[PDB]
Amino acid sequence: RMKQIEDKIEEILSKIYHIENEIARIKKLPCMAKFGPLPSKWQMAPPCVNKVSDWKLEILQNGLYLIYGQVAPNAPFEVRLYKNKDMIQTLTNKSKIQNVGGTYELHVGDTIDLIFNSEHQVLKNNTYWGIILLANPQFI
Amino acid sequence: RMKQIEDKIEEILSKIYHIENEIARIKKLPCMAKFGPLPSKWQMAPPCVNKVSDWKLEILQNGLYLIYGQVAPNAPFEVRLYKNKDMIQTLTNKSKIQNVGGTYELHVGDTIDLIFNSEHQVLKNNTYWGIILLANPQFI
Amino acid sequence: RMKQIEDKIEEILSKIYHIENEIARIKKLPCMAKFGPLPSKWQMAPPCVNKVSDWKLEILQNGLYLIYGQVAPNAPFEVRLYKNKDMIQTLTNKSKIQNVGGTYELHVGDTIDLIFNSEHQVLKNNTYWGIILLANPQFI
Numbered sequence: 271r272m273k274q275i276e277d278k279i280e281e282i283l284s285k286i287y288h289i290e291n292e293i294a295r296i297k298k299l300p301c302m303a304k305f306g307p308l309p310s311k312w313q314m315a316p317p318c319v320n321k322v323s324d325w326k327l328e329i330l331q332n333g334l335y336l337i338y339g340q341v342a343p344n345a346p347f348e349v350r351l352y353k354n355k356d357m358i359q360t361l362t363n364k365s366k367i368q369n370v371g372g373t374y375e376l377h378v379g380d381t382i383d384l385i386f387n388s389e390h391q392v393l394k395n396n397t398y399w400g401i402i403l404l405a406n407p408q409f410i
Numbered sequence: 411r412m413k414q415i416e417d418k419i420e421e422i423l424s425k426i427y428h429i430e431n432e433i434a435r436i437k438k439l440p441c442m443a444k445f446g447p448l449p450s451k452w453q454m455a456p457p458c459v460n461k462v463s464d465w466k467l468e469i470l471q472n473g474l475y476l477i478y479g480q481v482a483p484n485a486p487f488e489v490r491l492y493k494n495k496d497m498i499q500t501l502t503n504k505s506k507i508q509n510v511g512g513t514y515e516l517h518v519g520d521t522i523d524l525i526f527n528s529e530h531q532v533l534k535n536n537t538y539w540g541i542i543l544l545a546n547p548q549f550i
Numbered sequence: 551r552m553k554q555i556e557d558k559i560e561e562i563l564s565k566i567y568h569i570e571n572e573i574a575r576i577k578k579l580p581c582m583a584k585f586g587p588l589p590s591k592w593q594m595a596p597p598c599v600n601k602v603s604d605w606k607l608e609i610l611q612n613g614l615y616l617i618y619g620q621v622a623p624n625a626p627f628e629v630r631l632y633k634n635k636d637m638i639q640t641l642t643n644k645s646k647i648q649n650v651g652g653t654y655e656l657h658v659g660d661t662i663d664l665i666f667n668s669e670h671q672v673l674k675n676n677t678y679w680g681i682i683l684l685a686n687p688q689f690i
Contacts, residue, residue, distance in 0.1 A: 271412065272551065278419050279558050285426050286565050292433050293572050302614070302687050315687030334442070334478065334542060336684075338614065338653035356507065367636065369652050372509050373478035375540075400655075402614060402685055404476075405542055407442050407455030411552065418559050425566050432573050474582070474618065474682060496647065512649050513618035515680075544616075545682055547582050547595030 303327060304339075304400030305384075318403045325399070326383040329376045333406035337371030337382065339399025341392060348387040351399075354380055364391075370399050375410050443467060444479075444540030445524075458543045465539070466523040469516045473546035477511030477522065479539025481532060488527040491539075494520055504531075510539050515550050583607060584619075584680030585664075598683045605679070606663040609656045613686035617651030617662065619679025621672060628667040631679075634660055644671075650679050655690050 301318035305311065305325050312321040318331040329335070341349050347364035350357050353374065361368050370384065384399050386392050441458035445451065445465050452461040458471040469475070481489050487504035490497050493514065501508050510524065524539050526532050581598035585591065585605050592601040598611040609615070621629050627644035630637050633654065641648050650664065664679050666672050 272555075275412075275415055275419065275555055278423075279555065279562070282419070282422055282426065282562055283558075286562065286569070289426070289429060289433065289569060292437075293569065293576070296433070296436055296576055297572075300685050302685055304687075304689055310689075313687075313689035315685070315689060334540075336476075336616075336653060338655070369654075371653065373476060373511065374509075375478070400614075405440050405442055405455070407444075407453075409444055409450075409453035409455060415552075415555055415559065418563075422559070422562055422566065429566070429569060429573065432577075436573070436576055474680075476616075513616060513651065514649075515618070545580050545582055545595070547584075547593075549584055549590075549593035549595060 301331070301403040302400060304398060306339075306394065306398035307396055308394040310398075319401065322381060322383075325385070326381060327401065329380040329382070330378060331403065331406060332377050332410045333375070334373065334404045334410060335376050335401050336373050336404055337399065337401050339370040339384070340367050340397065341370060341384075342367045342396035344391055344393045345388050347391055349392065350385050350387075352381075352383040352385060367396070371401075373404070377410070441471070441543040442540060444538060446479075446534065446538035447536055448534040450538075459541065462521060462523075465525070466521060467541065469520040469522070470518060471543065471546060472517050472550045473515070474513065474544045474550060475516050475541050476513050476544055477539065477541050479510040479524070480507050480537065481510060481524075482507045482536035484531055484533045485528050487531055489532065490525050490527075492521075492523040492525060507536070511541075513544070517550070581611070581683040582680060584678060586619075586674065586678035587676055588674040590678075599681065602661060602663075605665070606661060607681065609660040609662070610658060611683065611686060612657050612690045613655070614653065614684045614690060615656050615681050616653050616684055617679065617681050619650040619664070620647050620677065621650060621664075622647045622676035624671055624673045625668050627671055629672065630665050630667075632661075632663040632665060647676070651681075653684070657690070 302315045303319050304313045320328045322328050341361050343364045349361040351359040442455045443459050444453045460468045462468050481501050483504045489501040491499040582595045583599050584593045600608045602608050621641050623644045629641040631639040
């Protein structure tokens with residue numbers, strides 16, 4: 271009868287250890303990435319995105335993303351944000367620092383790219399763009 | 411004295427079971443909805459919103475929402491997003507695919523509607539809009 | 551041998567109490583602030599922001615923020631949103647209610663201010679702006 275009690279106590283300790291493991295994991299528990307400003311390249315925080323090349327990223331998780339950034343201006347001025355082949359934003363103003371992005375549903379395999387007409391039209395040390403995953407509902 | 415120990419062990423098991431219940435619930439624990447592209451109608455992920463009619467939704471929780479979507483163009487072109495009776499955005503460009511929405515504080519009872527000037531001006535299979543609840547602070 | 555069992559049971563109870571404390575804290579666990587519409591002044595929900603003056607706020611945590619609001623129009627019309635000294639948005643339209651803000655990376659010490667050309671150009675009872683912290687990755 272002592273042995274039973276002692277065997278239950280051993281089982282209880284083990285469950286408590288398991289629980290503290292679950293709690294540790296809960297305490298630890300969004301996906302984001304940013305390119306630039308140079309000299310910084312891709313910075314990230316399963317991944318929802320994969321860097322492709324400078325200024326260009328690939329989406330690895332279906333979902334609702336917010337894209338953000340700024341282009342600092344330094345041949346007509348033109349900076350374009352692309353989703354795959356579709357131009358999704360064009361920046362045209364050479365005087366002011368301009369915001370880039372918006373909220374987009376994106377699917378596995380999509381790419382996002384920020385392309386400069388002339389590389390030297392832009393102050394690469396105050397120009398950057400990033401992305402954050404807001405949600406991944408089943409319907410996307 | 412054995413009985414006490416055994417009764418405490420029974421009480422402990424029950425508390426552990428309760429704890430694992432609380433953990434299960436924590437592990438399980440945003441509100442979102444999307445209309446379209448057709449043939450899809452309302453898709454959702456207490457609810458913060460209630461569908462009203464096609465393209466139209468009602469808010470059931472006070473809060474800060476982000477509205478998103480795109481209108482794919484196919485009589486002057488005009489698509490309008492409404493909050494109640496107030497037009498909150500107008501889309502006028504027949505060439506490019508255009509984003510819809512922005513961040514809005516919304517209150518219980520508000521409605522959001524996307525209204526097309528001509529139904530057939532739009533490619534309904536690449537046009538959709540959705541909403542996500544970002545936060546519900548007391549001040550809204 | 552009884553004493554050992556009893557001492558283990560005491561230790562177990564204490565661990566369970568600790569666990570329920572951790573769970574309580576987990577259950578309790580975004581930073582936001584809103585100014586206006588008047589007569590309301592600053593409303594908030596370590597803080598990520600500190601009010602400075604009416605319509606003006608200081609950032610105390612590095613991070614990615616979404617700024618939102620609306621200006622309800624009532625000398626050429628001009629309302630400007632500032633980040634430090636940089637104008638980041640200008641509102642110029644005296645007919646429609648206009649959205650303010652966008653997504654911005656902000657650093658400790660930055661200020662955000664909404665400045666009216668003429669105070670009485672605006673309906674202060676339907677004009678307000680607010681901010682929400684989306685994320686604080688190491689790279690900001």
